[PDB]
Structure formats: structure tokens, C-alpha cells
Amino acid sequence: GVVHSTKMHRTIIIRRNYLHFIKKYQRYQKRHKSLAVHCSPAFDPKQGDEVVIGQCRPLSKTIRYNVLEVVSK
């Protein structure tokens, strides 16, 4: 996904974009989803960067993923 916000402490919001297909009209829609991810101090991502995340045990009310790799800009 892509980094959407970095205002929390050691937590970021990422966004996933995809196209959904409607069978009746034979055409697509644009949709998106948001996730909260824990970000270790070993990384320094910025808004707009692309990250790779992995699933882990529940860490808070909304966090279920950890950042594994950052691809800058």
C-alpha cells in the first residue's frame, strides 16, 4: 500500500486502491480501504511512499499489521 498519514506515535495509516467490477454494466469502479499499521523506528516512511506489511497478532483496537519494508518515493 501507500502511506497516507504519519501523525501518530509509531503508527501510520496506509491506503489500498483497487478496481471493483460491476457485472450488469460490464464496467469498473474505483474503491479504497484504509489500515492502521505499526511502524518500527528502523524505518522512516513519508507520505506517498510504498510499504510492504505483514500480519501479526492484535496489537491495539485497530492495529493488525507491521511494516516490513519501505520503498522510497
Binding site: 467490477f21 460491476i22 454494466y25 474505483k30
Partner: protein, 142 residues
């Protein structure tokens, strides 16, 4: 010149059709509770009532006749309607405070024929079919 055509334009097409379906009178009547609340039967096909009085309704032009009808009050919700007594001389089978079964007149709430504002019809009185009494296949109880 009249439709969007883009490959990724499904959201526009979906919202367009949803909005324009409310202009169809048949579709709107099916998805709105206004019609059911005003319908005396409340969505049923038949209803029972108590005869209040006998009245005569004049036909509409260019016909000329006195149509024999009856005023009944529905048991389930205490509403007043007017119902038609179909066949020849069948008004003599009905007395006040009798219990009758009422059905529709065939056009789903619209008025039928030259009878002004009548959309109901008597089909059974005192637990015996009205048409059976007309054909003398049964006798009026009590």
C-alpha cells in the same frame, strides 16, 4: 451523445438508474408504504365485514341504471367501504348486521365499469357463497 461510455464509469451508470426508477409509477408503488396504508384491505386479497345498510348507486353516462351496492365495515381495522352485489336479485339474500366476505373488483384498486368509485365486490354471505345461493345449490342458514 446521450450516455456515458467510459470503461471505468460504473458508478455514474449505477446512480443514474437508481434515481430514474422512482419515475416509474408501478415501481414506486411497490417500494413505498403509502399505497398499503391507504388500502382498506391492508395488502390482503379478501376481507370480512358487517353490513351497515343497503344503498343504490346510479350509473354513469351514457348508461342509466340503479346499481345495488352495500356499505360494510371491516372487522380487522374498522374501515368503511362500498361493495357491489353482482347478480340479478341477489340483494334479497343480504340483511343488515350480516357477515360478508369481500374481494377486489379486478383492477387492483381502480374503479370498474360505469359504477362511480366502487372497487369491491361481495362474494360470500353467512359462510355460504353468494353465487351458490343465486344458483340455488345451497340454502341460506338460520
Amino acid at each position: 451523445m446521450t450516455k456515458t461510455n467510459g470503461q471505468n464509469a460504473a458508478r455514474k451508470l449505477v446512480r443514474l438508474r437508481c434515481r430514474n426508477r422512482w419515475a416509474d409509477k408501478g415501481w414506486k408503488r411497490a417500494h413505498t408504504f403509502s399505497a398499503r396504508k391507504a388500502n382498506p384491505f391492508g395488502g390482503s386479497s379478501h376481507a370480512k365485514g358487517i353490513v351497515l345498510e343497503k344503498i343504490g348507486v346510479g350509473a354513469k353516462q351514457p348508461n342509466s341504471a340503479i346499481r345495488k351496492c352495500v356499505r360494510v365495515q371491516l372487522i380487522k381495522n374498522d374501515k368503511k367501504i362500498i361493495a357491489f352485489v353482482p347478480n340479478d336479485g341477489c340483494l334479497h339474500f343480504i340483511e343488515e348486521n350480516d357477515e360478508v366476505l369481500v374481494s377486489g373488483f379486478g383492477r387492483s384498486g381502480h374503479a370498474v365499469g360505469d359504477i362511480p368509485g366502487v372497487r369491491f365486490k361481495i362474494v360470500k354471505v353467512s359462510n355460504v357463497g353468494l353465487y351458490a345461493l343465486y344458483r340455488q345449490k345451497k340454502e341460506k342458514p338460520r
